Design an enzyme around this catalytic site. Structure first.
Site, mmCIF file in Angstrom:
data_model
loop_
_atom_site.group_PDB
_atom_site.id
_atom_site.type_symbol
_atom_site.label_atom_id
_atom_site.label_comp_id
_atom_site.label_asym_id
_atom_site.label_seq_id
_atom_site.Cartn_x
_atom_site.Cartn_y
_atom_site.Cartn_z
ATOM 1 N N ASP A 1 1.857 7.598 -30.697
ATOM 2 C CA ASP A 1 2.660 7.649 -31.927
ATOM 3 C C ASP A 1 1.834 8.094 -33.142
ATOM 4 O O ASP A 1 2.328 7.981 -34.277
ATOM 5 C CB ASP A 1 3.339 6.280 -32.156
ATOM 6 N N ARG B 1 1.572 8.805 -38.584
ATOM 7 C CA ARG B 1 2.145 7.776 -37.733
ATOM 8 C C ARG B 1 3.660 7.969 -37.671
ATOM 9 O O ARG B 1 4.301 8.046 -38.693
ATOM 10 C CB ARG B 1 1.834 6.383 -38.302
ATOM 11 N N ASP C 1 7.024 2.340 -31.665
ATOM 12 C CA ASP C 1 5.781 1.718 -31.283
ATOM 13 C C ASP C 1 5.526 2.113 -29.830
ATOM 14 O O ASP C 1 6.225 1.652 -28.933
ATOM 15 C CB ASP C 1 5.782 0.218 -31.566
ATOM 16 N N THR C 2 4.505 2.952 -29.638
ATOM 17 C CA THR C 2 3.968 3.214 -28.316
ATOM 18 C C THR C 2 2.936 2.147 -28.002
ATOM 19 O O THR C 2 2.287 1.622 -28.905
ATOM 20 C CB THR C 2 3.359 4.625 -28.272
ATOM 21 N N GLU D 1 -0.807 0.948 -26.912
ATOM 22 C CA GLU D 1 -2.132 1.504 -27.133
ATOM 23 C C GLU D 1 -2.558 2.134 -25.815
ATOM 24 O O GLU D 1 -2.035 1.697 -24.770
ATOM 25 C CB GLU D 1 -3.129 0.421 -27.550
ATOM 26 N N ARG E 1 -2.147 6.542 -43.519
ATOM 27 C CA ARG E 1 -1.451 7.429 -42.603
ATOM 28 C C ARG E 1 -0.116 7.857 -43.217
ATOM 29 O O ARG E 1 0.634 7.018 -43.744
ATOM 30 C CB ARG E 1 -1.096 6.748 -41.270
HETATM 31 C C1 LIG Z 1 5.252 2.559 -38.269
HETATM 32 C C2 LIG Z 1 4.660 1.843 -39.452
HETATM 33 C C3 LIG Z 1 3.586 1.029 -39.357
HETATM 34 N N1 LIG Z 1 3.023 0.357 -40.432
HETATM 35 C C4 LIG Z 1 1.916 -0.592 -40.262
HETATM 36 C C5 LIG Z 1 2.401 -1.928 -39.738
HETATM 37 C C6 LIG Z 1 1.218 -2.462 -39.019
HETATM 38 O O1 LIG Z 1 0.299 -3.092 -39.972
HETATM 39 P P1 LIG Z 1 -0.493 -4.259 -39.118
HETATM 40 O O2 LIG Z 1 -1.462 -3.681 -38.100
HETATM 41 O O3 LIG Z 1 -1.215 -4.873 -40.245
HETATM 42 O O4 LIG Z 1 0.546 -5.200 -38.503
HETATM 43 C C7 LIG Z 1 0.611 -1.181 -38.414
HETATM 44 C C8 LIG Z 1 0.972 -0.854 -36.993
HETATM 45 O O5 LIG Z 1 0.553 0.518 -36.687
HETATM 46 P P2 LIG Z 1 0.149 0.783 -35.140
HETATM 47 O O6 LIG Z 1 1.393 0.457 -34.388
HETATM 48 O O7 LIG Z 1 -0.175 2.273 -35.169
HETATM 49 O O8 LIG Z 1 -0.992 -0.047 -34.923
HETATM 50 O O9 LIG Z 1 1.070 -0.118 -39.223
HETATM 51 C C9 LIG Z 1 3.591 0.447 -41.675
HETATM 52 O O10 LIG Z 1 3.136 -0.188 -42.619
HETATM 53 N N2 LIG Z 1 4.673 1.294 -41.773
HETATM 54 C C10 LIG Z 1 5.318 1.951 -40.737
HETATM 55 O O11 LIG Z 1 6.309 2.630 -40.983
HETATM 56 CA CA LIG Z 2 1.160 1.719 -31.366
#
Ligand SMILES: Cc1cn([C@H]2C[C@H](OP(=O)(O)O)[C@@H](COP(=O)(O)O)O2)c(=O)[nH]c1=O
Ligand SMILES: [Ca+2]
EC number: 3.1.31.1
Length: 129
Positions: free
Chosen positions: A15, A29, A34-35, A37, A75
Site C-alpha cells: 500500500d 500511502r 491496509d495491506t 506488512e 507520506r
Molecule cells: C492510510 C492512513 C494511515 N495513516 C496513519 C495511521 C497509522 O499511524 P500509526 O502507525 O501511528 O497507528 C499509520 C498506518 O500506516 P501503515 O498501515 O502504512 O503502517 O498511518 C494516517 O494517518 N492516514 C491515513 O489515511
Molecule cells: Ca500496511
C-alpha cells in the site's frame, strides 16, 4: 476529485510506493486500505500485486481526497490509478487488503472499496481464505 500525473519512482510494499509528483519524490500511502506488512501472511503477494500493477502501467495518476494530503509521517495520501484502474480498489477486490483507516473528510471512495471487500470475502480470496 481529480486525477493528477505522477511517475513511478519505486514500488515499496502493498500500500506504499515512491512517486514523483509535481517534480518531487514522495512516498505515497494508499487511502482507505491496509495491506499486510511484507513480513506477514499475504504481505509478499500484496507487494507483488501492486508492484506489477504500477510497473506495468503506462500511466500512473494520483487523486487526492477532500481532506489531508499528507500523513503524520510525511507520506502523500491518495487514490492511485494505473491506466485508469484504481490500485486501492484492486488490492481490496483481490482480498490482498482490508478497508481501513477510514477518517472523515478523506473517505470519498469508501462505499466502492467496501463493495469490493464484500465480494473478496464472499469469494474467500487470499486474506479471507
Ligand atoms: C492510510 C492512513 C494511515 N495513516 C496513519 C495511521 C497509522 O499511524 P500509526 O502507525 O501511528 O497507528 C499509520 C498506518 O500506516 P501503515 O498501515 O502504512 O503502517 O498511518 C494516517 O494517518 N492516514 C491515513 O489515511
Ligand atoms: Ca500496511
Amino acid at each position: 476529485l481529480h486525477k493528477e500525473p505522477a511517475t513511478l519512482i519505486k514500488a515499496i510494499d502493498g500500500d506504499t510506493r515512491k512517486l514523483m509528483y509535481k517534480g518531487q519524490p514522495m512516498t505515497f500511502r494508499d487511502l482507505l486500505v491496509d495491506t499486510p506488512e511484507f513480513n506477514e501472511k499475504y504481505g509478499p503477494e500484496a507487494s507483488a500485486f501492486t508492484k506489477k500493477m504500477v510497473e506495468n502501467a503506462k500511466k500512473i495518476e494520483v487523486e487526492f481526497d477532500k481532506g489531508q494530503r499528507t500523513d503524520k509521517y510525511g507520506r502523500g495520501l491518495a487514490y492511485i490509478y494505473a491506466d485508469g484502474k484504481m490500485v486501492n480498489e484492486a488490492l481490496v477486490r483481490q482480498g490482498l487488503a482490508k478497508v481501513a483507516y477510514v477518517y472523515k473528510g478523506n473517505n470519498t471512495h469508501e462505499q466502492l472499496l467496501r463493495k469490493a471487500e464484500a465480494q473478496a470475502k464472499k469469494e474467500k480470496l487470499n486474506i479471507w481464505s
